[PDB]
């Protein structure tokens, strides 16, 4: 039998990790145990950049990574993680399957020995606030907590809010005291930190859509039998369907939980947001040398 090593920053009990175990179960079934999967969670081998280098060298067999995260090595890939470029996951999936996506996935393989087998939906960031946000006009003046990360800052800046960097442990009390007016995160994070206790409103801003690519080392892929390749390919697709459905289900359950706890959930029109991000798309189109963003948005 063969044992493949899979590493990830997520921890036990997470959806990424539960889907890795379902992949391990599925590989045991479809191979009669000829394939077994050993899981290294909690960034015990390093962060995604480190485990991606381990895939390049063949020291790690499989790992997760976002499509946009390739922008550190393949700069045009950052386009898909610019705010509001991806309208929903099926749009981000159509970008993954597009000529643009195939070209990135070709460059991943030929340069870095990363074979991307599939992409999975991993949730969407939404915005909570102490006052209702029914349109982009309400964002003016909003003290909005973002991580110190380029695109989350740009989302706050260009919607008209006042981006407020702050360490994650300090935010609950800052929302409680209204020192900060709101924050933006995935819905499971909002329940996890119990931000809903100190936030009366939740806007479905859908400003950032997240994916996980499932990447296997080409050095491992070349050593595998073509039967095993087919088993792995089919197992990843089967588990990705379930992973995407699990995330979509938990978001719907969390919105229903927030509505049951008295939270006002707003659904603003997002085309004003898309038009408000155009200065950031222009900065990207010009630095990348090709008008790419208008191209992904129209898919």
């Amino acid at each position, epitope marked *: 039998a063969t*044992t493949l*090593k899979m590493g990830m920053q997520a*921890s*036990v*009990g*997470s959806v990424e990790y539960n889907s*890795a*175990k379902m992949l*391990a179960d599925t590989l045991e079934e479809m191979s009669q145990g000829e394939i*077994k*999967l*050993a*899981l*290294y*969670p*909690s960034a*015990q081998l390093g962060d995604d950049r480190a485990m991606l280098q381990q895939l390049t060298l063949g020291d790690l067999d499989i790992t997760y990574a976002e499509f946009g995260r390739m922008g550190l090595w393949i700069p045009r890939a950052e386009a898909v993680m610019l705010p509001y470029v991806a309208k929903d996951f099926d749009h981000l999936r159509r970008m993954f399957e597009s000529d643009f996506g195939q070209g990135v996935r070709d460059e991943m393989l030929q340069k870095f020995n990363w074979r991307a087998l599939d992409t999975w939906y991993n949730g969407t960031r939404e915005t909570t606030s102490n006052r209702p946000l029914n349109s982009i006009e309400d964002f003016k003046g909003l003290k909005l907590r973002v991580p110190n990360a380029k695109q989350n800052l740009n989302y706050a800046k260009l919607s008209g809010a006042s981006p407020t960097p702050m360490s994650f442990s300090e935010v609950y009390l800052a929302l409680q005291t209204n020192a900060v007016d709101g924050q933006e995160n995935p819905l499971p994070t909002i329940k996890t930190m119990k931000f809903y206790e100190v936030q009366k409103n939740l806007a479905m801003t859908h400003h950032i859509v997240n994916d996980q690519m499932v990447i296997i080392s080409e050095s491992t892929w070349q050593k595998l039998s073509d039967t095993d390749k087919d088993i792995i390919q089919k197992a990843v697709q089967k588990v990705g369907d379930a992973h995407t459905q699990t995330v979509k289900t938990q978001e719907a359950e969390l919105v229903s939980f927030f509505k049951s706890e008295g939270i006002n959930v707003t659904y603003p029109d997002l085309e004003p947001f898309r038009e408000a991000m155009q200065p950031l798309y222009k900065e990207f189109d010009s630095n990348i040398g090709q008008p790419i963003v208008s191209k992904l948005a129209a898919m």
Partner: nanobody
Amino acid sequence: QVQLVESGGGLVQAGGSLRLSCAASGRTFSSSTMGWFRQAPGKEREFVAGISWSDGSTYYADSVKGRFTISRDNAKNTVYLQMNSLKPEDSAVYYCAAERWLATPQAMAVTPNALDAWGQGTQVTVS
């Protein structure tokens, strides 16, 4: 599901030795990382030791390293926590835990309530 059952426990003297056993019911034990937790009365749960299935790695909490030893017997589908040089600090309910496919044991402690299987613990009283 997986059924885990502990053996061993009871009263022991300070400085004494005790061996805990944990037998697993199915045929997933050879592909499961195994661990030992403990909860002393009134305190939080502490991950004590763990042992891998794939790369043989072990974990110990600093409070027991150098005087607990963990080991595995796949032929009997059993893990052992061998408590040498026991201290009153060690008095607690001890719990056996299993997690399939996980390769690295220290990660069991991060979200213990999500782990695959648990035994209903065994009390160890040190005098």
